[PDB]
Design a protein around this ligand. Structure first.
Ligand code: BR
Ligand code: BR
Ligand code: BR
Ligand code: BR
Lengths: 8, 225, 222, 6
């Protein structure tokens, strides 16, 4: 439900 | 004990203890020894600063949300204090990237990794900046991501997870910072489609790494369209 | 300023910035006005979170150091020194501003319990010549708090129950007196149990939560 | 897993 940026 | 190998071992101990500010300070010391970072060491540096700046970004969003919902001087002053600290962490990472990590030599993977990190830390500065300073920071983030995109398209296959992660973040930059949703959606769609065409030619370990980022690209497309 | 420092402590709590929250509460204490029950809880939550993170990091490092290398020892000592600095700050506030002869039994027991707790955290990492001194300081503070609570508070009061719970943990883990730990938890539970049916709605959750913790410790130790 | 006051 919230936008994704790279987990690193 | 603060030779390069001791600093890396201390960064690994700090990671296990969830002491991310200590972990980042140990990785900063290791980078300043002047030697290139291995893939494992790059990931340690990245995880450490992402956790540090992630806590400040989360605190800033709680404060900004209270400050906006109320529309006293206390929320503004405390929000400015958290902002100043976040800016100091980003300036430290940008300083390391400029003076030690970004260089002409090395594989395309390492060059794209650090240029992507430069775009990311300018993007975190852009999230809290205002006026003309915000405009310059937005143009600095775009230049770093664009230089990284040019290298990745020429030297990496479309399923490479560093290439995919860079497109994911640059797409977030277009959507939230640059206010260019059309460019954000088209970059995420193109990146997803070009990787999709080559997924069948990967090993189980590589397939798992590429598809994980491809799911994030899809999740953003589902959220925005 | 005092109203601003307390409001900033509440904002820091929402943002999960516990070191900032503790520094704002420290500034509010240094104004000289007594803390309300809500303000005491803000001070307690802030420092408990800060020292809780250091205690957890210390246990991870100590466990690696024992399972196994000068690096683990040096880094463990660095975390220890930081934890000690936080405890010394809390003990300093308690001595210079919070612990007094005046005030209700409730506030006096609260701060004396906090003094026992922060000396108990110092005792967890003490290994040298100061260890005995640190343990007797934790013991003396809890004992003085127990004497006041038994004379001036009902056996179901959550501050009285929480003090007995922590002093019982002190006996078990620090003083190596498990019989004294079990008998204190058993006596505290039984004396509260006899008055449970007359307990007021305001203390229902707090009193019953600590009675469950006393029961959990007894089940673990016996 | 002993408990002290939260
Ligand atoms: Br402030
Ligand atoms: Br160290
Ligand atoms: Br000692
Ligand atoms: Br007693």
């Amino acid at each position: 439900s919230s936008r994704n940026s790279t987990p690193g | 004990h603060m030779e390069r190998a001791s600093l890396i071992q201390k960064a690994k101990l700090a990671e296990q203890a969830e002491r991310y500010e200590d972990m980042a300070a140990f990785m900063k010391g290791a980078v300043e020894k002047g030697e290139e970072l291995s893939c494992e060491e790059r990931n340690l540096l990245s995880v450490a600063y992402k956790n540090v700046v992630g806590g400040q970004r989360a605190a800033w969003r709680v404060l900004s949300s209270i400050e906006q919902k109320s529309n006293g001087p206390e929320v503004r002053e405390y929000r400015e204090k958290v902002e100043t600290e976040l800016q100091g962490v980003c300036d430290t990472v940008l300083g390391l990237l400029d003076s030690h990590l970004i260089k002409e030599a090395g594989d395309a993977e390492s060059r794209v990794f650090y240029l992507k990190m430069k775009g990311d830390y300018y993007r975190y500065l852009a999230e809290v900046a205002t006026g003309d300073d915000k405009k310059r920071i937005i143009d600095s983030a775009r230049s770093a991501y664009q230089e990284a995109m040019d290298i990745s398209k020429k030297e990496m296959p479309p399923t490479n997870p560093i290439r995919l992660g860079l497109a994911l973040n640059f797409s977030v930059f277009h959507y939230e910072i640059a206010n260019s949703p059309e460019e954000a959606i088209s970059l995420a769609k193109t990146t997803f489609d070009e990787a999709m065409a080559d997924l069948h030619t990967l090993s189980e370990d590589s397939y798992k790494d590429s598809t994980l980022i491809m799911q994030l690209l899809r999740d953003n497309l589902t959220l925005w369209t």
